[PDB]
Design a binder for this molecule. Structure first.
Ligand SMILES: *[C@@H]1O[C@H](CO)[C@@H](O[C@@H]2O[C@H](CO)[C@@H](O)[C@H](O)[C@H]2NC(C)=O)[C@H](O)[C@H]1NC(C)=O
Ligand SMILES: *[C@@H]1O[C@H](CO)[C@@H](O[C@@H]2O[C@H](CO)[C@@H](O)[C@H](O)[C@H]2NC(C)=O)[C@H](O)[C@H]1NC(C)=O
Ligand SMILES: *[C@@H]1O[C@H](CO)[C@@H](O[C@@H]2O[C@H](CO)[C@@H](O)[C@H](O)[C@H]2NC(C)=O)[C@H](O)[C@H]1NC(C)=O
Ligand SMILES: *[C@@H]1O[C@H](CO)[C@@H](O[C@@H]2O[C@H](CO)[C@@H](O)[C@H](O)[C@H]2NC(C)=O)[C@H](O)[C@H]1NC(C)=O
Ligand SMILES: *[C@@H]1O[C@H](CO)[C@@H](O[C@@H]2O[C@H](CO)[C@@H](O)[C@H](O)[C@H]2NC(C)=O)[C@H](O)[C@H]1NC(C)=O
Ligand code: NAG
Ligand code: NAG
Ligand code: NAG
Ligand code: NAG
Ligand code: NAG
Lengths: 324, 324, 324, 324, 324
């Protein structure tokens, strides 16, 4: 039973060098706030109890079941699920006692996406590997990350990868932090361009005379089209607790503007049916509406240029597990 | 085989201290009435049979397979599925016999959502860990919960967490109760604002004269838009057996109001085609319809302020498993 | 190897008492004809070989791995998948040899839904636990069901639960039969109310004069709305091989009625464009159409009150596995 | 280690009798070309090494772990995934050495659907169980199929089941072939009836005069409705590599016909706006369009009655695994 | 423990011959950039330690558990998940020491799809099997691929399969490269034909006079139809980081063209309402719009004929794992 026990480095804790290869980051689900990735962990340590004389055994390296010798069990706190692609990994031990273990795992880990500037948003995703069964006085970690992502043509691109060992911890752990940027043009072309086109179409349709019967139907059909587009957007974009994306607010403002234009058109047409004052009011409202649309565009551009989110840290983030 | 047996505390049952860390609550599916969460359970007890003299073994703590020594098997009744993120957990035993076991598990547990006040609804979710293979006279539980949720920017926010050991039980168990509040603005902006806008647009379109050919098409297009919106809402909101959400009733009432307005407009236009009495009837109905819309808004606001649901407890809730 | 063998009761087969607790019935998928449930099975039998003298062993009860002593392996024929929430269950054995085993399992079992009277339909769901590896002369079952469902606020409510041991069987098995009733108002409000409203709107729009240009557009927009609603319904309702739901036939009849009204309106308007006879024909058709709509409503109400389905039993139902 | 080895029948290979019970065929996904089924395999063979004298052991039958004695491992080539509903099956051995093993498995197997005549299409689904670890000179199979399907009220009904052992094979295998017929009326009512109704409505709307302003809007609204219906159909029907369903071609032809009618109406109305020749051309085109619609209906009916698909066999079908 | 060790070929590394049978390629998800396949790997090597004299053991071949003798553990870097359809594979060893192992596995592997020419696009999918626990000086691979795909009637057809052992590698691995071509007509008929039909309909509707009230509604309804179609396309097509499909750009250009036509029509109609110059401007714009539509068609055809994508290789592709 002593073989299964963690090797004793002496007064200092045992040092395990971890090399992390990020094979891919495939699913990035903003709706579920989850990021899916594939990792290869190479864990290397020294176990002098496993060292053998080369004269007795000619082999320079052997393979042993992971349940025979001591292997540090790693658990990811943020991972919704972990799938280890090896049922029973085999640890490779050199003649000097160096033990190297290779683990391939696909993990769906929780990531806090800052979706305020969607679609051009940047987020930080953290994968914290914890050795729950061990203590900091017994185990120490050196984590190195190697960028080996096999796919680059995706909506989200990882552009910064790093590893850190947080100080003042009781449970030994290492955190791999990556930065995700969204470069997908699907959302923009899908929603923003049709929305701007519909808004400009409504602005130009405001030129139609009040007495024309084709103006009301035109405006209402545009309103229905924008209602469909807004429904698609809101069903597509996730809703945060504190910092919702600016796009939903922008589309809500545009929807209210289109509704206001349609209601004004219908009300003034009805009043005129019962240059009269409805026509002058319609012209004044058209000028005011064009000015307001331009002002709304400029104000939202300024907001997008200078918006900030002071999202309060979650209890897990503010007070992480296994510290002090 | 005696090692696998539960330790004997004597006349009193063995005491196990359970510390629960809620890492995240990620999926909250109202349609399926399920809540998905990640938990870390630290179970600590005393096993004097495992105590060893420090002189014989210099190690101050050892790690053993969970199938070697006695580990209490915990089963969650409400959990649709449980995924233990460790294939074979390792129990850490101190020199004095104290055994500590760390279990990381992702569970999809049944939660009874009170959806009457959707979207601003509060619900209670309970996770009941049961030691089915043991009896109350043999095992006792002390459950402590620590709020370590890593994500706060989600639709549902946990704002109250507690643990309890129900009295007069035959199967030892402990229940973790959490409170879920919905702070998502996606539903409101998606549905309520377009619905109110369409209702006000129909009210203002009632101003159009009966003889106008543009009024019927306007009202029917608005009716189609609200039909699409109502279909989206009803396909989005789940249906409870007894207390359905107030939103579906509100949207049904608004849909009936819009249908009544359209049918009145069409009928009176047809009668007029065959100040005449259809025009006076149209004006009277317009006044009555505006008054009725305002009254419906006020009555539903009052209902929302003072609605209650005396939802009868389920047989599992009224008569919980393993009691007396 | 004799311990793993089934205990010998003598000439009579061994008797196993099974207590079934239905924790929840969560997914009821009519489209897939599957019902998902969670069950707790307490299996109790007598094994005199495991009995021990209390003088030798002070323990009054012990726990053993399920692979050490004989445990009856239960297989569900109708279950699409079974998930046993315990990797290795532990059997509790008393000093007298009584063995009790607790198994928690989540099962997706096939259920034959009688969807003729959707949404107010009642169905029978059967879960047949079979001991395939054993014979009837060796194993006997006593099955008891306890209603411990934890959620009652769902679309489908279980209102009758029972257990039975079919006679003249070769493979020992026990069947848990439950009755599912649908109390969801989502389908009704979603589909029936808009359908009736659109039908009545078309009936009232038949009042519009033939020469009016607003009648054709009104009827066609209503037709498009009902086409969308009918598409939503047919994509929502499953299609049985023999007894399809009455709702799809009702909506098809209403869709044909609306198409007939629109085609008549367009044809007579075109003929009139080229009191004339088209107007008299339009009035006669309007009267006939109102009468036909009322007659269709009454006839379908009578059919719903007196419809029956003599659905032929499936080969598995007519000839169940392991009989004679 | 000799117990695990396959029993020696002598010069002839060992004979294993396989009885297959098809409990259900639940998912039949045309889009993924996969069919999901549940099977119970009873494998019986003779192992004289396991025979015991009744005098020494009074038991007439024993149960052994499947990893103790030789059990043929069966692999399905077409199965996307297999789920064995028993973690560790137990083999029942009689006193004479007869070994019977019961395996319950849910499999998602690839099936080549002939979707040319959708929805009234017939397909052949094959499940090939292979003993990869064994050779034909060592193992032989006798496969019998019993129709025990528990659900008959589904879209696809199995009406023919058979088993075969292909000749001239090196890897012992047996193939269960079943015939699937689609009896679902959901697709027909959902798509064909609305399509025919819209086509006839457009034909009747061709009666409207060219100078009428209501004709263009009518035709365009019908065109939009048929566009929505065609989009729903094409997103519903899968696309084969060589033999696509006739329904998509039929709906494409109808969509082109409706577009041609709308374009002709708009062009001639515009030319007339600038009995004149546009009116005579419109009447001639109306007659030609009615004749063409009738001819298209008759030609497609004849094609449906006499269409054939000589789909080239896949490399796996033409050259099956483990032959010669 | 020496049996589990890799056999020693001497100075040269041990040679393992791998035969790969591709049973099927079923899911090809462009949105997730993943390809799902089923493979059968036959791994053959020589282990003289397992050779036995035929005089002692009459058997010419034996079967052993994969955990008894040395079996090379293969890991796929690009595979999102791997499902080995055998819980415990059995290795067949001949009398001369030749060991053959058959592994059936269903894998979802990452594939970089070149979607620039969608739907008629060709892509390369690579499956890299790595022996992480071994070194190149100890293990060598010979990989052979056999095309045994059981389904050919799918959207994506594999038309080229090959195997390669990359040179200058430290971790022994072999790569199976296949070529995927899309032959599905679902996308074309679904989107391109309706888009071209709507564009030509708008072009022909430009013939309508400016003063006509039916022109604006016609153009706006066509615009709404194309908006729905464009939304369906963009929600259907995935978005790459660098080389988006040409279809989304084409549909965006067509949508902008339709919006420009509608805005011009509405603006000039409004100006005319307030041969006049609006009519001459409308005719000139109609000619310019027809010319521009034809020019856009020709330019996009030329682009499609001569477009190229120099997609930069991903860090995993440029620097593959286990080299030098
Ligand atoms: C045992 O503890 C010592 C001290 O922490 C470790 O030695 C350190 O190793 C790292 C990198 O390998 C160096 O950066 C430090 O400078 C070293 N410190 C000293 C005092 O030497 C040693 O690696 C540990 N050995 C094992 C097997 O864990
Ligand atoms: C054995 O039983 C005793 C009595 O229940 C336990 O002692 C109690 O422990 C809790 C907290 O540890 C205290 O709140 C009580 O005051 C204690 N009661 C008494 C009489 O001392 C004891 O913890 C149990 N020991 C084990 C190993 O389970
Ligand atoms: C052995 O067989 C006998 C006879 O079937 C079983 O005794 C019956 O038990 C049930 C309920 O426990 C009673 O309803 C019957 O009246 C009993 N019949 C007789 C003749 O006693 C007995 O339970 C079986 N014992 C075991 C361990 O299986
Ligand atoms: C051993 O081989 C013989 C010959 O194939 C098998 O005997 C045959 O069994 C089948 C059905 O059981 C009969 O249809 C044949 O007529 C039999 N042939 C002969 C020559 O007898 C025998 O079943 C095999 N025994 C075992 C244990 O596999
Ligand atoms: C041991 O190493 C030798 C040399 O690599 C292997 O022999 C080669 O085998 C391949 C195909 O089997 C031939 O193409 C080469 O020509 C052979 N080279 C020589 C020098 O013979 C041999 O296969 C290896 N043996 C084992 C068990 O791995
Ligand atoms: C992400 O982490 C880095 C520190 O490594 C920090 O500078 C940056 O502000 C973070 N970005 C976001 C969007 O949180
Ligand atoms: C939830 O539980 C608390 C008791 O802890 C209770 O006071 C409260 O009424 C419950 N809330 C709901 C919505 O049931
Ligand atoms: C369900 O089973 C009961 C018998 O327990 C039977 O009386 C009833 O007719 C069945 N109901 C249906 C809808 O099949
Ligand atoms: C299916 O298999 C049978 C032979 O058993 C064959 O006669 C028939 O033509 C096949 N049907 C189809 C649609 O391939
Ligand atoms: C795919 O791989 C082959 C080499 O085998 C190469 O010639 C070809 O250009 C590649 N095709 C694509 C689309 O990358």
């Amino acid at each position: 039973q002593e073989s299964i026990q963690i090797p004793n480095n002496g007064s200092a804790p045992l040092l395990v060098d971890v090399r992390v290869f990020v094979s891919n980051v495939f699913n990035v689900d903003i709706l579920r706030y989850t990021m899916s990735s594939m990792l290869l962990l190479r864990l290397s340590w020294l176990d002098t109890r496993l060292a053998w004389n080369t004269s007795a055994h000619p082999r320079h390296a052997i393979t042993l079941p992971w349940e025979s010798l001591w292997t540090p069990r790693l658990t990811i706190l943020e991972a919704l699920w972990v799938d280890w692609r090896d049922q029973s990994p085999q640890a490779r031990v050199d003649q000097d006692g160096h033990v190297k273990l290779n683990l391939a795992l696909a993990t769906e880990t929780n990531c806090n996406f800052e979706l305020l500037h969607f679609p051009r948003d940047h987020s930080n995703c953290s994968l914290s590997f914890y050795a729950l069964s061990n203590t900091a006085m017994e185990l120490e970690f050196q984590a190195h990350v190697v960028n080996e992502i096999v796919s680059v043509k995706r909506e989200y691109v990882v552009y910064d990868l790093k590893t850190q060992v947080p100080p003042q911890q009781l449970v030994p752990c290492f955190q791999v932090t990556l930065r995700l940027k969204n470069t997908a043009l699907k959302s923009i072309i899908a929603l923003l361009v049709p929305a701007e086109a519909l808004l400009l179409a409504d602005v130009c349709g405001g030129l139609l005379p009040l007495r024309a019967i084709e103006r009301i139907g035109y405006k209402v059909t545009l309103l229905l089209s924008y209602l469909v587009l807004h429904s698609s957007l809101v069903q597509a974009l996730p809703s945060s607790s504190s910092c919702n994306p600016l796009l939903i607010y922008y589309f809500t403002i545009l929807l209210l503007l289109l509704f206001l234009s349609t209601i004004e058109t219908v009300l003034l047409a009805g009043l005129l049916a019962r240059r009269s004052w409805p026509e002058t009011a319609d012209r004044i409202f058209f000028l005011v509406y064009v000015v307001g649309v331009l002002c709304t565009q400029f104000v939202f551009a300024g907001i997008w240029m200078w918006a900030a989110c002071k999202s309060d840290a979650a209890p897990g983030e503010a007070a992480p597990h296994g510290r002090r």
